[PDB]
Amino acid sequence: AKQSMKAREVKRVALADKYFAKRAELKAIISDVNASDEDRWNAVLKLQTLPRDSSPSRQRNRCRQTGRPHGFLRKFGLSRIKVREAAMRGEIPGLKKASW
Amino acid sequence: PRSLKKGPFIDLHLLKKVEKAVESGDKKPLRTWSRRSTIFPNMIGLTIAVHNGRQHVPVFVTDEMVGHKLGEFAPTRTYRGHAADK
Amino acid sequence: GQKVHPNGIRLGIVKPWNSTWFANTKEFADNLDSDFKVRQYLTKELAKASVSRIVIERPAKSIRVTIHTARPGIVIGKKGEDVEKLRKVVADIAGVPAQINIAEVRKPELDAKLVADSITSQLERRVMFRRAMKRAVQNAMRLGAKGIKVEVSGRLGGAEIARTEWYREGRVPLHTLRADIDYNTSEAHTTYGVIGVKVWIFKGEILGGMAA
Amino acid sequence: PRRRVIGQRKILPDPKFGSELLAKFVNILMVDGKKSTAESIVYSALETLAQRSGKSELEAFEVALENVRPTVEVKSRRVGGSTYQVPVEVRPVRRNALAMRWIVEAARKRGDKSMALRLANELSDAAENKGTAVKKREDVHRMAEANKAFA
Amino acid sequence: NQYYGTGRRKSSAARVFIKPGNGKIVINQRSLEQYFGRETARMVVRQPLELVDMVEKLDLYITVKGGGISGQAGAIRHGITRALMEYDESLRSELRKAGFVTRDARQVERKKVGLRKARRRPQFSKR
Amino acid sequence: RIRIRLKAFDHRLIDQATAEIVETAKRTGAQVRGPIPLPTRKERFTVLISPHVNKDARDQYEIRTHLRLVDIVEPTEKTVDALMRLDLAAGVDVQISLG
RNA sequence: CGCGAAGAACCUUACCUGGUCUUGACAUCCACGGAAGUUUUCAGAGAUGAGAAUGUGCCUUCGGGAACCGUGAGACAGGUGCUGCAUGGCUGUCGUCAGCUCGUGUUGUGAAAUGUUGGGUUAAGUCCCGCAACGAGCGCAACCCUUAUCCUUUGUUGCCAGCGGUCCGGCCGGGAACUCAAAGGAGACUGCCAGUGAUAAACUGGAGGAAGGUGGGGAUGACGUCAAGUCAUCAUGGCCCUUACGACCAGGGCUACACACGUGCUACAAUGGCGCAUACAAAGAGAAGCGACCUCGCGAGAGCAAGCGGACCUCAUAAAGUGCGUCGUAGUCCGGAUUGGAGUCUGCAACUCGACUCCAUGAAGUCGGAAUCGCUAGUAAUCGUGGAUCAGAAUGCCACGGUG
RNA sequence: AAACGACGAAAACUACGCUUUAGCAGCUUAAUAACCUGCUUAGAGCCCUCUCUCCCUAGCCUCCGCUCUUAGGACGGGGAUCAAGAGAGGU
């Protein structure tokens, strides 16, 4: 991928982890039905106050080694090409050709 | 549509503009890039120059539109004619 | 594509893995990220040294990278100081403390990675690819390998159109899954592009499968 | 088809009666692998037409089937737009299968109360040489003599 | 101490015990009228018994699991065939002639990659 | 009371581990119930190995995980000393359950 | 042409309209001043412009160092800008076709030929015979993975041949034969019996076997052809910009007004949808995740949540079918496409742009012209389910099964 | 449009290096040879290093964390250095 794109991922994840404490304890008020609409509205408007890419939903899953949005495996953490290369070279334990 | 638990969704900077427009002196249109902000009765009468992608288009707000997004009254792409309407 | 990688087709039969550990995918991604980082750091550092391969074991709260190399003395250093120097960086990169092992590889001209290495250096220092490959294959045949196959492709001799040349001696049964088909790749960064080199070394027929 | 001369796979033992011809007929009738519904429908039509005729069930089915089992069909082993048609006498193995296929094709042509009633009429009239399968067979037999220059 | 025979057809396991008791049938804490749906299964789970005289001569306490209705029927058939063979040692020839000893090894084929089914391929683009 | 579970990628590295643990339990204690296997899990992956437009070049990769379980043989204090030893060769995950 | 994309509201995202930066978002060398950092007020769509209460973190002889930021540059950083007609790597096609070659010898001055042709035989350059051929390599097979039978080793979370009681439930005492779990072996090797053939190779039938000629499937894809496809996974030689093709943010577009083409789904109806009971599977997932039960719900779901890193607990009474009525060939109790009203879940935020739920509305269609596509056995059809990336989004993809 | 390909007669990564024999192997009509050779057996002369052979000390810990602590150990610190030597290796 691009250097700017890769830096965007770390910049988003850092601010998402830093503000994770506020996001959960702020959406808790919204989720709590037993609350006043005056505090519900305040919580709703205060959540849009923090910077946008501060949520886990606003980040992608580019592969660590190279960087590729389309094509990824959560268990392996790399794109399809890199996963195949690692499997063929033996870097992934207990991974062989499936044939049933 | 959005769940009624969270209620209407508007921009934070939009509330300040709406308050300043009604209090006091509205002569210039309210310039907002936000289109997801729901319309409120406070904005009735006031001019909203809503951005659609190229340039802000003026929208005159009446009581008919309340439970609709402000971006609905803003075409995204210009249409003139498919058969080369010159 | 014509040929599949001959390692990961018999990894489960006769060939050993280059990474031996376990995970429940709670930490699998970070484990391979760490393995990739340590492998690339070792490759970048031990450039002059002819590193044969890098195996990694990851026991509980510790790691053990068993580098196999042809000339271990350069990595070892006097009184074993260089290994201690380069062990702390690996330990702090991987988090858990490390214990680096070094294994000398007998017959340095019979290893796939070793024979794929230094031919790129010859190409960089402008040694003719044909004579280089011929010397490599004849030395490998003389040392005892039953079959050697060397392919070199891409901008050979600084020409205008890239091609693919290859030499082969003895027998290279790529289709059988009961033989040592140790294979590795390498690339050369010359003045007019990049040259790809592939080497297949068939040593013998390992009867009985894994574990001898 | 080119070098292999296949045999024949065994058919269901027909648990109700034991007729391999009946098993072939129900296998031709069934579609989408839904054996249960097709077998129920064919059994109901089986009973209805047997009790409408009066004679024994299978002994009437065989005589109604042999009366529209064709003898000679017409084929065309020609290539190109121009075609020559040659009559070929059907073997007994394919004769019953073709007759059953014609019967099931003609069955789904009447707007009766149910599929069983659709089957029953065109299955019973075959004994008296009436219906649609017999109507098409008496023209298939004429096709052979329509142009029998090459045989 | 009564011996028995085991039977499987596609993916179903059925084991049936043989005892001198005359014609007491219960299929996995059920009966033929319970595990039913079509007469074909009932007929096919009694063919070794209906062969010569064993219709009402020894009871059938089988319990069967897995597969579908036809798979369970085939598994029960193979199990009773093996049980009768082990019990008598002379009905094996008749069972081989009827084709009951030979277990049907046919199972569902795997789905290939690029194909919509095991052998059905996507339609060619009008070329 | 106590049980030991072993997860392995290959059976070669787990059969010897089970043999070692049962011989240690025989040295310290007796009355072993034997290592019981559990249904192994096979995680599949489909990777299209072509780095561009070709939805016909696929590879099927498989990760196998085998489970072994060893229960109590003689619950005492000495039998835990020989079982709380250093971990075995890398590649075998050992879980200790107590209750 | 349901291709990269294993799944676009901002993210991804490059394009456009608007705003900002000139050693930069992303490194190394630096001179300083402060460790950082933690809440926060305004302008602003944000990028960043200011303003504060602050932290005064651990380190020797203290002009200190980790490390963090701000200012000033310089090399430099940067490009999804181009050149797959410079390439590495990877991949498609012929084709899982059966051929492609070499060493020695021989033949012809020589390009070259034999070997590789000819006779049987085959899935096959598989084997035999004959022959200036003799051998070998890449190759077609086997070794590798799954399944089809049996034996043994060890029985919990998996089973109940035998017994006891019962809360009739595997409930648990207990029983380690079985269904099953996953390890090692036996086992099918033309082995034999006849016929055929050239006294062979090989073929046809059969006593045995779960199995018969590769038992049934998968992986394995030669020499090479297509300047075949990717310089936008990545790397790489020149060429191009360094106040801009580079860097940051907000809103739109990839999902679009007259159409055509391709691959799939719903269907057309009495083989059917409808209302109420009721069985039969396998393979997989689960830790800020799967999520039992109770209660509100006509509903997607909501409060409550136990158990579960998982043979234990969930996802998840599988459908087809089977039982009974009902619909009688019908603008149909057929098709659920369009449209209006109000919501439920996930997501700072579904108007551009997800899905589920209710009410109503009820487009076509009523078996499809030339010309075409796949399949020879648990295969074609028909029914349901799981899983990949994923906050949510399949009629697609990848696999299990039921019937067949 | 286009597309040819001649010299490690630049043994060029330097294993301490350099020796004889022991047998396999390519060389062959055939048994030596030059070696094309990877080892195996033997001696180290030697460029090199390490434990060293000096003395003192008893320096000796190890279970229970530490306290004189017991069977026993292969157990054990400081200092300048060598004549020859007993063993391991070759950064």
Strand F58-70 and strand F36-48: the pairing is antiparallel
Q: In 3D, which of C109, C127, C131, C103 has the Cα closest to residue C188?
A: C127
| H or E element at residue F28 | none
Measure Cα distances from B56 to A96, B12, B74, B77, C77 in Å.
59, 20, 9, 13, 71
Rounded to an integer, what distance in angstroms lies between the CA atom of residue A97 and that of residue B2? 47
Q: In 3D, which of A81, A3, A86, A60 has the Cα closest to residue C36?
A: A86
Q: Could you give the residue ranges of the DSSP H alpha helices within chain C?
A: 28-45, 72-76, 81-94, 112-116, 119-124, 129-143
* Amino acid sitting at position B11: D
Q: Which two tokens stand for residue C71?
A: 């000339």
Rounded to an integer, what distance in angstroms lies between the CA atom of residue A93 and that of residue A95? 6
Note whether C22 contacts F93, CB cutoff 8 Å. yes
Question: At what resolution in Å was this solved?
Answer: 3.2
Planar angle of CA B54, B60, B63, nearest 5 degrees: 135
Helix and strand tally (H, E) in chain F?
2, 4
* Amino acid sitting at position C110: L
| H or E element at residue D70 | none
C160 beta carbon to strand G: under 7 Å: yes
Rounded to an integer, what distance in angstroms lies between the CA atom of residue F14 and that of residue F64? 13
**Which residues touch C15 (CB under 8 Å, ≥6 apart)?**
A90, C7, C180, C181, C182
Give the one of D10, D12, D16 whose C-beta lies nearest to E39's C-beta: D16
Q: In 3D, which of C36, C44, C5 has the Cα closest to residue C18?
A: C36
Q: In 3D, which of C125, C122, C135, C118 has the Cα closest to residue C186?
A: C118
Q: Give CB contacts under 8 A, 24+ apart, made by E66-70.
A: E66/E11, E66/E12, E66/E13, E67/E9, E67/E10, E67/E11, E67/E12, E68/E10, E68/E12, E69/E37, E69/E38, E69/E41, E70/E9, E70/E41
For E34, other C-beta atoms within 10 Å of its C-beta total 10
Measured in angstroms, the CA of F38 and the nearest CA of chain E are apart by 20
Rounded to an integer, what distance in angstroms lies between the CA atom of residue F22 and that of residue F61? 33
* Cβ–Cβ < 8 Å for B38, B72: no
Rounded to an integer, what distance in angstroms lies between the CA atom of residue D79 and that of residue D97? 27
Rounded to an integer, what distance in angstroms lies between the CA atom of residue A22 and that of residue A43? 11
CA distance from start to end of chain C = 33
**Which residues touch A29 (CB under 8 Å, ≥6 apart)?**
A35, A39, A40, A43
Experimental method: cryo-EM
For C30, other C-beta atoms within 10 Å of its C-beta total 14
CA pseudo-torsion sign B72, B78, B80, B81 = negative
| H or E element at residue E124 | none
Q: Which two tokens stand for residue C15?
A: 């060939």
E31 beta carbon to strand G: under 7 Å: no
Q: In 3D, which of D133, A76, D94 has the Cα closest to residue C35?
A: A76
* Amino acid sitting at position A21: A
For C139, other C-beta atoms within 10 Å of its C-beta total 14
Q: Could you give the residue ranges of the DSSP H alpha helices within chain A?
A: 3-18, 20-31, 37-47, 80-89
Q: Which two tokens stand for residue E92?
A: 């094996």
* Cβ–Cβ < 8 Å for A12, A20: no
Q: Which two tokens stand for residue B49?
A: 């120059």
Sequential DSSP letters for E86-101: HHHSSTHHHHHHHT-S
Rounded to an integer, what distance in angstroms lies between the CA atom of residue C210 and that of residue D74? 65
* Chain centroid, CA D101 distance in Å: 4
Chains touching E, CB cut-off 8 Å, 3+ pairs: D, F
* Chain centroid, CA C148 distance in Å: 16
* Amino acid sitting at position F42: K
CA distance from start to end of chain E = 68
Local structure of residue E126 (DSSP, 8 states)? -
Q: Could you give the residue ranges of the DSSP H alpha helices within D12-132?
A: 20-29, 35-53, 57-66, 92-107, 115-124
Rg (CA), chain F: 19
Note whether A41 contacts B15, CB cutoff 8 Å. no
- Which residue reads 């890769």 in tokens? A6
Rounded to an integer, what distance in angstroms lies between the CA atom of residue C88 and that of residue C94? 10
Q: Which two tokens stand for residue E105?
A: 């090894």
Chains touching A, CB cut-off 8 Å, 3+ pairs: B, C, F
Name the phi and psi angles at A91, rounded to 5. -75, -15
Strand E4-8 and strand C64-69: the pairing is unpaired
**Which residues touch E51 (CB under 8 Å, ≥6 apart)?**
E91, E94, E95, E98
* Cβ–Cβ < 8 Å for B39, A64: no
A38 Cβ under 8 Å from any chain B Cβ? no
Helix and strand tally (H, E) in chain C?
6, 8
Q: In 3D, which of E38, E62, E58 has the Cα closest to residue E49?
A: E58
Q: Give CB contacts under 8 A, 24+ apart, made by C56-59.
A: C56/C18, C56/C19, C56/C20, C56/C21, C57/C19, C57/C20, C57/C21, C57/F89, C57/F90, C57/F91, C58/C19, C58/C20, C58/C21, C58/C22, C58/C31, C58/F90, C59/C21, C59/F87, C59/F89, C59/F90
For D122, other C-beta atoms within 10 Å of its C-beta total 26
List chain G nucleotides near protein: any atom < 7 Å from a Cβ.
1-14, 16-17, 25-26, 38-39, 43-47, 77-80, 86-93, 95, 123-124, 136-150, 153-157, 160-161, 178-184, 208-211, 215-224, 227, 229-230, 233-237, 246-253, 256-258, 261-264, 270-272, 279-288, 302-303, 309-311, 318-323, 328-329, 342-352, 355, 372-382, 388-391, 397-404
**Interface with chain D: mutation pick from E40, E69, E70, E117, highest number of D CBs within 10 Å:** E40
CA neighbours closer than 13 Å in the CB half-sphere of residue C197: 26
**Which residues touch D89 (CB under 8 Å, ≥6 apart)?**
D71, D72
Helix (H, G, I), strand (E, B) or coil at C58: coil
Rounded to an integer, what distance in angstroms lies between the CA atom of residue F81 and that of residue B18? 74
- Which residue reads 């702090």 in tokens? C92
Sequential DSSP letters for chain B: ---TTT-----HHHHHHHHHHHSS---SPEEE---SSBP-GGGTT-EEEE--SSSPEEEE--TT-SSSBGGGGS-SS----TTT--
* Cβ–Cβ < 8 Å for B40, B62: no
C79: nearest nucleotide, CA–C1' criterion: H91
* Amino acid sitting at position C1: G
Measured in angstroms, the CA of E9 and the nearest CA of chain F are apart by 22
Instruction: Count Cβ neighbours within 10 Å for each residue of B8-35 and write b for 16 or more, e otherwise.
Output: eebbeebeebbeebeeeeeeebbebebb
Rounded to an integer, what distance in angstroms lies between the CA atom of residue E69 and that of residue A32? 51
Local structure of residue E47 (DSSP, 8 states)? T
Helix (H, G, I), strand (E, B) or coil at F87: coil
Q: In 3D, which of E64, E51, E66, E58 has the Cα closest to residue E83?
A: E58
Residues in chain A: 100
Omega of the bond leading into B24 within 30 degrees of 0 (cis): yes
Q: In 3D, which of C21, C82, C89 has the Cα closest to residue C55?
A: C21
Q: Which two tokens stand for residue F38?
A: 């559990």
Question: Which chain D residue is nearest to residue E37, measuring alpha carbons?
Answer: D36
For D25, other C-beta atoms within 10 Å of its C-beta total 24
Q: Which two tokens stand for residue F36?
A: 């019981």
Residues in chain E: 127
A76 Cβ under 8 Å from any chain C Cβ? yes
Chains touching B, CB cut-off 8 Å, 3+ pairs: A
* Amino acid sitting at position C199: V
- Contacts F87 to C, Cβ<8 Å: 59-60
* Cβ–Cβ < 8 Å for C203, C110: yes
Q: Which two tokens stand for residue B55?
A: 């340039």
Give the one of C22, C59, C211 whose C-beta lies nearest to F12's C-beta: C211
Rounded to an integer, what distance in angstroms lies between the CA atom of residue C118 and that of residue C129? 12
Rounded to an integer, what distance in angstroms lies between the CA atom of residue C176 and that of residue D149? 62
CA neighbours closer than 13 Å in the CB half-sphere of residue D30: 16
Rounded to an integer, what distance in angstroms lies between the CA atom of residue F89 and that of residue C20? 9
Local structure of residue F47 (DSSP, 8 states)? E
Give the one of C11, C19, C22 whose C-beta lies nearest to A96's C-beta: C11
Which residues in chain B, range 23-62, keep a C-beta under 7 Å from any nucleic strand G atom?
31-36, 51-55
| H or E element at residue C198 | strand C193-202
Sequential DSSP letters for C11-57: TTTTPPPSEE----SSSHHHHHHHHHHHHHHHHHH-SSS-EEEEEEE
Q: Which two tokens stand for residue C142?
A: 């003389």
Rounded to an integer, what distance in angstroms lies between the CA atom of residue A54 and that of residue A96? 39
Local structure of residue D11 (DSSP, 8 states)? P
E68 Cβ under 8 Å from any chain D Cβ? no
- Which residue reads 């109604």 in tokens? D64
Q: In 3D, which of C47, C64, C42, C46 has the Cα closest to residue C55?
A: C64
* Amino acid sitting at position B4: L
* Cβ–Cβ < 8 Å for F29, F73: yes
* Cβ–Cβ < 8 Å for A6, A68: no
For B81, other C-beta atoms within 10 Å of its C-beta total 7
Give me the torsion for CA of B26, B32, B38, B44, rounded to 10°.
20
Q: In 3D, which of C112, C110, C114 has the Cα closest to residue C46?
A: C114
- Contacts A81 to F, Cβ<8 Å: 49, 51
Q: In 3D, which of D11, D36, D24, D19 has the Cα closest to residue D104?
A: D24
- Which residue reads 């802000």 in tokens? B56
* Amino acid sitting at position D46: L
